[PDB]
């Protein structure tokens, strides 16, 4: 892990308390704009779908990658929510119920066996089953989900491949013939002034025969700045380079 | 499959004869602007990329979905056939080198075997091995092409569900958050009036909850009109509500 103060320019202007992790070819090449912030542990939000759209496929809780989940007809928080959707939409449009009926249904023996297994966090998923990622316990760092999607990426979590391979599919955000992205973004509102909320922006990048791992988060209080866990970490990627 | 003749108003007005099946969440729902055209055979060209990558993998031939394909100092008439391709590079771009190359190492009797268990238009594959495809024996139909796009898509092709999920994933062309689109050209080269080339684009389209399967293929002797193989089925598709 080296420190680059270069790329705190991007967090300046913002007045961003951030940090961006990005790996060239695997974890043992990072470099950060923060070395401390790099590993302090953070709710994960959203990000947590990863982990818990590969459990719950390991599990059978997910019957495959073309299953469909339904829609009920009733209220939920984001009007992008009520609609059946596949795996990848949910994960692409972060519907939330979905994923808490996953992790109500994976439950707490097995939810905490994964997290073990996949080195996730501090792993303590207290707080309750269907929350404890946006409200409860559960911290992990930039590092570490750098670490965890690297594991992905080359397919080496604890879950068998062709559950690996789904998530990934799912998880792609940017096509082009020498260039794909696999990205989730992650928010878990905006706290207080004191203790602020936290906002992810995690993946790798496919770049001709090349690979970049990332890793953003920033405090945020402010809702309006939410799309900076976007803009600042593609403008450091694209004055590396990464298209 | 029925016959929708108001589809050729698209094929007139740019002068091409030309085939154009589309079908909406199986291949027992299918439409066609052209009954007989739609069963007609044409070499398959580059759409036969799909198959031979699975092929590849499936023999072990393709070491797995990181193997990168190294130039060697090939002379090559193309400057394409001088970079290092990733599997999905190497489908998406002119390598032709590299099919090829994979084609000889599969050999006869794998091929033969394994286009066999895909049902792959009329299983010719005399003409050469490493060019069977572009100009030798092999005819395909564009109804073959969605049967066959769809067995891939159901991880039903007679290959791992991995090596499947591992072409799939490498035939992203667009992404959005709700729509995800799997697609191939082909193209065998510009012929005359009486001897023209075939053009295609075989693929699907995953919309919300919905997939279509889709193939098209056109007569070409004229190299100006090779786009045409996306702009017509991208017009029929947005008349259709697809896009």
Redesign the interface.
């Known amino acids: 892990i080296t420190e680059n103060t270069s790329w705190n320019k991007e967090f300046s202007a913002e007045a961003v308390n951030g940090v961006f992790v990005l790996c060239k070819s695997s974890s043992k090449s990072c470099a950060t704009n923060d070395l401390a912030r790099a590993s302090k542990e953070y709710l994960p939000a959203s990000t947590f779908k990863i982990p818990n759209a590969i459990i719950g496929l390991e599990t059978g809780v997910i019957k495959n ?2 299953q ?1 989940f339904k829609w009920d007809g009733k209220p939920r928080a984001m009007k992008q929510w009520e ?4 795996l ?2 949910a994960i ?2 972060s519907a939330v119920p979905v994923f808490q009926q996953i992790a109500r249904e994976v439950g707490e023996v097995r939810m905490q066996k994964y997290l073990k297994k996949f080195s996730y966090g501090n792993q303590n998923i207290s707080g309750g089953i269907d929350k404890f990622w946006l409200e409860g316990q559960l911290r992990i760092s930039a590092v570490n989900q750098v670490e965890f999607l690297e594991s992905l990426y ?1 397919n080496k979590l604890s879950a068998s ?2 559950n690996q ?2 998530v ?2 799912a998880l ?4 082009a ?2 260039y ?1 992205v696999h990205s989730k973004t992650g928010f878990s509102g905006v706290g207080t002034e004191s203790n602020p909320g936290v906002a992810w922006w995690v993946g790798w990048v ?1 770049k ?2 090349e690979v970049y791992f990332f890793a953003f988060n920033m405090d945020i209080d402010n809702e309006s700045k939410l799309p900076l866990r976007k803009s600042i970490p593609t403008k450091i990627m694209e004055s590396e380079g990464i298209i």
């Open positions: 990658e073309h469909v609609r059946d959707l596949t990848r939409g692409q449009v080359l491949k062709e391979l789904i990934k599919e792609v955000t940017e096509a013939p020498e794909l496919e001709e025969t």
